[PDB]
Design an enzyme around this catalytic site. Structure first.
Site, PDB file in Angstrom:
ATOM      1  N   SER A  60      -5.209   6.042  -0.886  1.00 40.15           N
ATOM      2  CA  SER A  60      -5.323   4.584  -0.916  1.00 40.15           C
ATOM      3  C   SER A  60      -6.549   4.169  -1.722  1.00 40.15           C
ATOM      4  O   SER A  60      -7.617   4.743  -1.535  1.00 40.15           O
ATOM      5  CB  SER A  60      -5.466   4.045   0.514  1.00 40.15           C
ATOM      6  N   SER A  61      -6.394   3.160  -2.600  1.00 40.80           N
ATOM      7  CA  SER A  61      -7.484   2.541  -3.360  1.00 40.80           C
ATOM      8  C   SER A  61      -8.242   1.644  -2.405  1.00 40.80           C
ATOM      9  O   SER A  61      -7.630   0.743  -1.814  1.00 40.80           O
ATOM     10  CB  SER A  61      -6.909   1.668  -4.481  1.00 40.80           C
TER      11      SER A  61
ATOM     12  N   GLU B 271      -1.879  -8.436   3.182  1.00 39.11           N
ATOM     13  CA  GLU B 271      -1.773  -7.486   4.272  1.00 39.11           C
ATOM     14  C   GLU B 271      -2.356  -8.029   5.546  1.00 39.11           C
ATOM     15  O   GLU B 271      -3.258  -8.870   5.523  1.00 39.11           O
ATOM     16  CB  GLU B 271      -2.452  -6.162   3.906  1.00 39.11           C
TER      17      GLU B 271
ATOM     18  N   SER C  95       0.859  -1.156   0.000  1.00 39.39           N
ATOM     19  CA  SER C  95       0.000   0.000   0.000  1.00 39.39           C
ATOM     20  C   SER C  95       0.921   1.240   0.000  1.00 39.39           C
ATOM     21  O   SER C  95       1.894   1.297   0.769  1.00 39.39           O
ATOM     22  CB  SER C  95      -0.841  -0.035   1.267  1.00 39.39           C
ATOM     23  N   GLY C  96       0.649   2.159  -0.919  1.00 41.72           N
ATOM     24  CA  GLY C  96       1.447   3.368  -1.128  1.00 41.72           C
ATOM     25  C   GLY C  96       2.741   3.176  -1.906  1.00 41.72           C
ATOM     26  O   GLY C  96       3.536   4.110  -1.987  1.00 41.72           O
TER      27      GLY C  96
ATOM     28  N   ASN D 155      -1.390   5.408   2.940  1.00 42.26           N
ATOM     29  CA  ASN D 155      -1.456   6.112   1.661  1.00 42.26           C
ATOM     30  C   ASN D 155      -2.571   7.164   1.748  1.00 42.26           C
ATOM     31  O   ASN D 155      -3.710   6.815   2.011  1.00 42.26           O
ATOM     32  CB  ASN D 155      -1.700   5.070   0.490  1.00 42.26           C
TER      33      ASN D 155
ATOM     34  N   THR E 159      -1.350   2.431  -8.322  1.00 47.90           N
ATOM     35  CA  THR E 159      -2.344   3.322  -8.976  1.00 47.90           C
ATOM     36  C   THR E 159      -1.690   4.360  -9.892  1.00 47.90           C
ATOM     37  O   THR E 159      -2.152   4.601 -11.015  1.00 47.90           O
ATOM     38  CB  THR E 159      -3.236   3.924  -7.904  1.00 47.90           C
TER      39      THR E 159
ATOM     40  N   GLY F  67      -2.234  -6.169  -2.358  1.00 46.39           N
ATOM     41  CA  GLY F  67      -1.660  -7.479  -2.107  1.00 46.39           C
ATOM     42  C   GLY F  67      -1.959  -7.974  -0.706  1.00 46.39           C
ATOM     43  O   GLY F  67      -2.868  -7.481  -0.027  1.00 46.39           O
TER      44      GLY F  67
HETATM   45  N1  LIG Z   1       5.951   7.805 -10.002  1.00 46.22           N
HETATM   46  C1  LIG Z   1       5.387   8.643  -9.126  1.00 46.22           C
HETATM   47  N2  LIG Z   1       5.583   9.973  -9.284  1.00 46.22           N
HETATM   48  C2  LIG Z   1       5.135  10.811  -8.340  1.00 46.22           C
HETATM   49  N3  LIG Z   1       4.482  10.526  -7.212  1.00 46.22           N
HETATM   50  C3  LIG Z   1       4.260   9.201  -7.104  1.00 46.22           C
HETATM   51  C4  LIG Z   1       4.660   8.218  -7.994  1.00 46.22           C
HETATM   52  N4  LIG Z   1       4.230   6.967  -7.570  1.00 46.22           N
HETATM   53  C5  LIG Z   1       3.583   7.221  -6.461  1.00 46.22           C
HETATM   54  N5  LIG Z   1       3.588   8.545  -6.099  1.00 46.22           N
HETATM   55  C6  LIG Z   1       3.078   9.149  -4.867  1.00 46.22           C
HETATM   56  O1  LIG Z   1       2.818   8.127  -3.925  1.00 46.22           O
HETATM   57  C7  LIG Z   1       1.419   8.114  -3.570  1.00 46.22           C
HETATM   58  C8  LIG Z   1       0.960   6.691  -3.360  1.00 46.22           C
HETATM   59  O2  LIG Z   1       0.979   5.992  -4.625  1.00 46.22           O
HETATM   60  P1  LIG Z   1      -0.156   5.031  -5.129  1.00 46.22           P
HETATM   61  O3  LIG Z   1      -0.032   4.841  -6.579  1.00 46.22           O
HETATM   62  O4  LIG Z   1      -1.540   5.610  -4.803  1.00 46.22           O
HETATM   63  O5  LIG Z   1       0.017   3.649  -4.341  1.00 46.22           O
HETATM   64  P2  LIG Z   1      -0.762   2.253  -4.247  1.00 46.22           P
HETATM   65  O6  LIG Z   1      -1.847   2.279  -5.238  1.00 46.22           O
HETATM   66  O7  LIG Z   1       0.267   1.157  -4.554  1.00 46.22           O
HETATM   67  O8  LIG Z   1      -1.293   2.103  -2.780  1.00 46.22           O
HETATM   68  C9  LIG Z   1       0.737   8.873  -4.699  1.00 46.22           C
HETATM   69  O9  LIG Z   1      -0.532   9.380  -4.305  1.00 46.22           O
HETATM   70  C10 LIG Z   1       1.776   9.948  -5.022  1.00 46.22           C
HETATM   71  O10 LIG Z   1       1.811  10.985  -4.041  1.00 46.22           O
HETATM   72 MG   LIG Z   2      -3.865   2.323  -5.246  1.00 53.87          MG
END
Ligand SMILES: Nc1ncnc2c1ncn2[C@@H]1O[C@H](COP(=O)(O)OP(=O)(O)O)[C@@H](O)[C@H]1O
Ligand SMILES: [Mg+2]
Length: 761
Positions: free
Chosen positions: A199-200, A448, A149-150, A196, A154, A446
């Site tokens: 977070s999704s 958790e 997560s984070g 996050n 996404t 994934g």
């Molecule tokens: N390549 C990237 N460039 C800039 N910021 C990013 C990038 N990847 C992630 N982030 C930052 O990290 C945060 C968390 O990423 P996210 O994609 O939402 O994670 P996940 O879906 O795996 O929980 C985003 O909201 C953003 O602030």
């Molecule tokens: Mg996500």
């Protein structure tokens, strides 16, 4: 001579071996003569000779192992190079800041049609490779984006979608639609969590469908397991879905008045959580004073480089307009959102000489009125359905706890049906009659575990068992079966299959999901009765244990009928079974279902156009359709890595990243990937493509022999390829050379044949 040896916080540290003992190596830390520490022989790894260099592909490392992999990605990350390959697998380390120009329209154009390795590692290259494989092999493709997560699943999903639609679209409104759909889905399905800010709270599979000319014709979004518990209560550091705060922060005063909105501290469904907005200096001045909670006025705004509640409300409204939503539909959505908020403000007080009943508190009169008005219900019918139960043909009083549960069940169902409507509405904005193929991007949480694990963790960890099995079947089983059939002599990497854990959860009649459904159908459902029936049915199952069997002190007081431990290979998880029966039912009680189905509002009736629908089995069916798609397509993998637990940039936590590299299974496949052959083509297909351009001397050669002359003439060698029994195989880092051999353009084909003719003389 210098080696990598363990370090508590950095994962590894550089040093020299100064002694050897039984089961130990004495290490001297680099430039610390005199100092020593013991390390286990198998925890010490060779280091690359040049500590300052970095390689774009980890397969290029002289000594590829977990330590050199960690070091290479660390060096790259310190220089804002967040993307690194392991052959055709992408590693993405979250930067936690916007790296300038790396996602530009100009960067997008520079990756189009480029072979892997020709351009620096990038999510765009993984996306381009999927497109090229799709068009060449005439086979649909999946891009699986994984990580904690984070970690960035996404964000990387969105970069893949944007790359594909911008590169291979038509230059029309519909290309932007697949991209504009995300701020809409995130508004209703994403929320602030401790791990996050964005977070999704649902999983997704987004497919971009293409016609025969490999041009985008539309898309399709599948959504999984929207978190319902979030809708009513959150922990003090977390928030409800973004929509509630985007609406409170950004709505015009006309909408605010019409929806009877106020600052978030005034709503039970928001006020247990954090009531502050994501804002900066500029955006805070755009949020009106009447929208700000006391906590926001004392503590100030929440900070994020991406999220802005006011800015996000404006961008969401613009997204809604771009996709084809008229103002009427936008206000219909907002009205449901506000209706759910007002519902949560309906309070109850005990009634009856033995407190067997309840009454709406007099202070909840306005909440009742606003809720009924916004949801098109009669106030009395709503008051009655929340405070009584219909059953011979009697209307019986509910206790306070049961009324709270009725209100919350209606709130969660209405909100969940609104989410389903939003996803379906987005699918209707980019429809297609037919398509030849698709590229699907998988973005789902994934494995958790937390101090307390409920039904939500159970379903996600169940999903992870099924996906982990697909990962093993694709990366290990199917890959090596090909190498074996072709006589490549690649060292075997084995795995222990987890069908016994999957069967435990999902088997017909005996699986946990079926035993849970059995409970929901019983006259008086009980979490305790469900839990003891699981223990009784699987007394001899190795993957199952009573909560008492746990080493951890937090599980010492948990009764046999209050939970179970699933011994997932990713770790043993203790699930507390309280509320599993309630959480497994997607259907509202008949009297609440009727109330909502008979709404005066057409939009509300349209959301709903012994009541029991199994959440577990509904999800099992969705996951099996997804697995059918994954098994029938080519797969590309992106492993997202979270660099620290503080959402900060330039903060590489070595041991945290190492642990993710180990747990992801990346470390276990390093030798298979480095010693593997990701590109291949049959001798027959290569020969047949060149045949018409060949002179007699060439056509007379057997396909295997023609391929050998072709590769020799082009200057290729054994470090580049290996011949199998029926196919030629190209090693990691040889994608450009393989694509040159595969290029089917008549001018290109004739040119290579001319080169072979010249080499032959
Ligand atoms: N390549 C990237 N460039 C800039 N910021 C990013 C990038 N990847 C992630 N982030 C930052 O990290 C945060 C968390 O990423 P996210 O994609 O939402 O994670 P996940 O879906 O795996 O929980 C985003 O909201 C953003 O602030
Ligand atoms: Mg996500």
């Amino acid at each position: 001579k210098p080696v990598w040896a363990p370090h508590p916080t950095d994962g590894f540290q550089v040093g020299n071996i100064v002694d050897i003992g039984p089961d130990s190596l004495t290490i001297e830390p680099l430039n610390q003569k005199g100092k020593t520490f013991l390390a286990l022989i198998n925890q010490v790894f060779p280091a690359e000779e040049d500590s300052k260099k970095d390689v774009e592909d980890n397969c290029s490392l002289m000594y590829l192992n977990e330590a050199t992999l960690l070091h290479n990605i660390k060096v790259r990350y310190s220089k804002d190079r967040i993307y690194t390959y392991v052959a055709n697998i992408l590693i993405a380390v979250n930067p936690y800041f916007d790296i300038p120009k790396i996602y530009s329209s100009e960067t997008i154009k520079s990756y189009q049609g480029k072979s892997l390795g020709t351009m620096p590692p990038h999510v765009f290259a993984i996306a381009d490779k999927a497109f090229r494989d799709m068009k060449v092999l005439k086979l649909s493709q999946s891009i699986i984006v994984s990580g904690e997560s984070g970690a960035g699943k996404t964000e990387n999903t969105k970069f893949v979608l944007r790359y594909l639609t911008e590169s291979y679209g038509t230059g029309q409104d519909i290309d932007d639609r697949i991209v504009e759909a995300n701020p809409l889905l995130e508004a209703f399905g994403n929320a602030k969590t401790v791990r996050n800010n964005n977070s999704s709270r649902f999983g997704k599979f987004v497919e971009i469908h293409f016609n025969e000319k490999s041009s985008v014709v539309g898309g399709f979004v599948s959504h999984y397991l929207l978190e319902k518990s979030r809708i009513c209560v959150q922990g003090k550091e977390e928030r409800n879905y973004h929509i509630f705060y985007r609406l409170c922060a950004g709505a015009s005063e006309d909408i605010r008045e019409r929806l009877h909105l106020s600052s978030p501290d005034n709503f039970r469904y928001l006020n247990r959580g954090c009531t502050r907005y994501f804002a900066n200096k500029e955006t805070d001045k755009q949020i009106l004073q009447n929208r700000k909670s006391p906590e926001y006025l004392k503590a100030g705004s929440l900070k994020d480089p991406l999220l802005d509640d006011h800015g996000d409300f404006i961008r969401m409204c613009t997204a809604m307009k771009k996709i084809g939503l008229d103002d009427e539909e936008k206000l219909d959505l907002f009205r449901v959102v506000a209706g759910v908020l007002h519902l949560g403000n309906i309070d109850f007080e005990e009634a009856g000489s033995t407190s067997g009943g309840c009454n709406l508190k007099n202070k909840s009169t306005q909440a009742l009125e606003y809720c009924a008005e916004l949801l098109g219900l009669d106030q009395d019918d709503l008051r009655v359905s929340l405070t009584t139960r219909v059953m011979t043909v009697i209307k019986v009083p509910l206790k306070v706890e049961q009324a709270n549960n009725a209100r919350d069940a209606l709130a969660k169902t209405v909100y969940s049906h609104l989410f389903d409507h939003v996803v379906n509405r987005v699918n209707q904005c980019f429809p297609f009659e037919t398509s030849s193929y698709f590229i699907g991007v998988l973005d789902i949480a994934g494995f958790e575990y937390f101090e307390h694990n409920s039904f939500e963790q159970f379903c996600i960890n169940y999903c992870n068992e099924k996906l982990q099995q697909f990962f093993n079947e694709r990366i290990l089983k199917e890959e090596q079966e090909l190498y074996q059939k072709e006589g490549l002599g690649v060292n075997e990497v084995h795995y222990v299959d987890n069908q016994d854990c999957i069967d435990l959860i999902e088997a017909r009649l005996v699986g946990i999901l079926d035993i849970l459904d059995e409970e929901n159908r019983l006259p008086q459902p009980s979490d305790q009765h469900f839990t003891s029936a699981v223990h009784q049915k699987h007394k001899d199952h190795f993957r199952l244990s009573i909560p008492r069997k746990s080493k951890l002190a937090i599980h010492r007081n948990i009764r046999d009928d209050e939970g179970f431990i699933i011994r997932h290979f990713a770790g043993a998880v203790c699930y507390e079974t309280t509320q599993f029966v309630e959480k497994n039912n997607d259907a509202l009680h008949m009297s609440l279902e009727s109330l909502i189905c008979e709404s005066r509002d057409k939009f509300i009736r349209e959301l709903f156009e012994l009541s029991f629908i199994s959440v577990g089995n509904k999800f099992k069916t969705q996951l099996n359709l997804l697995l059918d798609k994954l098994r029938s397509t080519g797969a590309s993998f992106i492993r997202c890595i979270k660099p620290n637990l503080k959402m900060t940039s330039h903060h590489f936590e070595g041991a945290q990243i190492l642990s993710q590299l180990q747990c992801s299974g990346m470390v276990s496949v390093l030798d298979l990937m480095q010693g593997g052959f990701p590109s291949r083509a049959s001798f027959h297909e290569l020969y047949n493509m060149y045949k018409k351009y060949m002179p007699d001397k060439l056509a007379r050669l057997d396909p295997r022999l023609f391929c050998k002359a072709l590769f020799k003439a082009l200057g290729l060698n054994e470090i580049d390829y290996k011949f199998g029994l029926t196919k030629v195989f190209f090693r990691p880092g040889k994608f450009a050379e393989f694509d040159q051999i595969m290029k089917s353009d008549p001018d290109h084909l004739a040119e290579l044949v001319k080169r072979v003719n010249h080499w032959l003389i």
